[PDB]
TrEMBL record:
<comment type="function">
    <text>Component of the PEX13-PEX14 docking complex, a translocon channel that specifically mediates the import of peroxisomal cargo proteins bound to PEX5 receptor. The PEX13-PEX14 docking complex forms a large import pore which can be opened to a diameter of about 9 nm. Mechanistically, PEX5 receptor along with cargo proteins associates with the PEX14 subunit of the PEX13-PEX14 docking complex in the cytosol, leading to the insertion of the receptor into the organelle membrane with the concomitant translocation of the cargo into the peroxisome matrix.</text>
</comment>
<comment type="similarity">
    <text>Belongs to the peroxin-14 family.</text>
</comment>
<feature type="domain" description="Peroxisome membrane anchor protein Pex14p N-terminal">
    <location>
        <begin position="9"/>
        <end position="53"/>
    </location>
</feature>
<protein>
    <recommendedName>
        <fullName>Peroxisomal membrane protein PEX14</fullName>
    </recommendedName>
</protein>
Length: 69
């Protein structure tokens, strides 16, 4: 395939990002580092935003975009 943009691949990205963010060591890593790392795993800004909300550590999309800029 499935292509990057398809829902099956978006869902693998966001669900893997959620697992990542839940790890206890990852919880003690700063936001910026985690955002750049999620970009390196293929997530868009909006998908990164989704993942952070899913784990109860919401960031604004503007904040995510700023970090990635
Ligand atoms: C930016 O900061 C960090 C980066 C990386 C690490 C090392 N790992 C951590 C656990 C971790 C990682 C990853 C990890 O890298 N998962 C893969 C992945 C993540 C995000 C988006 C993806 C999108 C497409 C494909 C894979 C993706 N996952 N856990 C926890 C869960 N482990 C499994 C897979 C068994 C599910 O229960 C990476 C870090 C380790 C400690 C602190 C910071 C870290
Ligand atoms: Cl947990
Ligand atoms: Cl924090
Ligand atoms: Cl979830
Ligand atoms: Cl924020």
């Amino acid at each position: 395939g499935a292509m990057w943009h398809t829902h099956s691949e978006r869902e693998k990205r966001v669900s893997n990002a959620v697992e990542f963010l839940l790890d206890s060591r990852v919880r003690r890593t700063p936001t910026s580092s985690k955002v750049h790392f999620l970009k390196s795993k293929g997530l868009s800004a909006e998908e990164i935003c989704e993942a952070f909300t899913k784990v109860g550590q919401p960031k604004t999309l503007n904040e995510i975009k700023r970090i990635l800029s």
